[PDB]
Structure formats: C-alpha cells, structure tokens
C-alpha cells in the first residue's frame, strides 16, 4: 500500500514509537546542557554569547 494518505508514512502503530524515541532521545541530551537555563535573560545584541 503505497498511495495511502497516511501521516509521515506511518503505516503501522509500531513506527510511532520509533519517531518519538528518536526526537526525545536527543532532546534529552540537548536539555542536559541548554535545558534548565534561565528563560528570562535577554540581550540587545544580534547574537548571544551567554554560556555553554
């Protein structure tokens, strides 16, 4: 079944758990440094050199 109008080509239910665990497994890596930072600290630059 090729020309089915299914979201992201997700034919079976098993392929979702592949997608969610791919974006989140790197998201959780990303939040280990850029997450848990101050969401209220600004700049009047064009580009921020805040921290790591």
């Amino acid at each position: 079944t090729e020309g089915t109008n299914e979201w992201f080509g997700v034919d079976d239910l098993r392929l979702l758990a592949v997608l969610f665990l791919g974006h989140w497994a790197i998201l959780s890596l990303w939040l280990g440094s850029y997450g848990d930072s101050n969401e209220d600290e600004d700049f009047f630059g064009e580009i921020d050199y805040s921290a790591r």
Partner: protein, 35 residues
C-alpha cells in the same frame, strides 16, 4: 518489508534530530571572533 522500515525511521530521525538540535545548540556563537 516492515522490519527494514522500522530500521530506517530510527536512522533518519536519529540524524535529523542531531541536525535540528545542533543549530539550537547556540550555533551562531561558535565563531572564531569570540567564544
């Protein structure tokens, strides 16, 4: 054939997520000017 297919969506959104969260990783600040 639905076992290979699972293996591809792992490999695609592994590297696509490294791409997406690469430029969200304060990527303009990685220059030889400062920091």
């Amino acid at each position: 054939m639905l076992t290979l297919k699972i293996l591809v969506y792992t490999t695609v959104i592994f590297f696509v997520s490294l791409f997406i969260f690469g430029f969200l990783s304060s990527d303009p600040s990685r220059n030889p000017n400062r920091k």
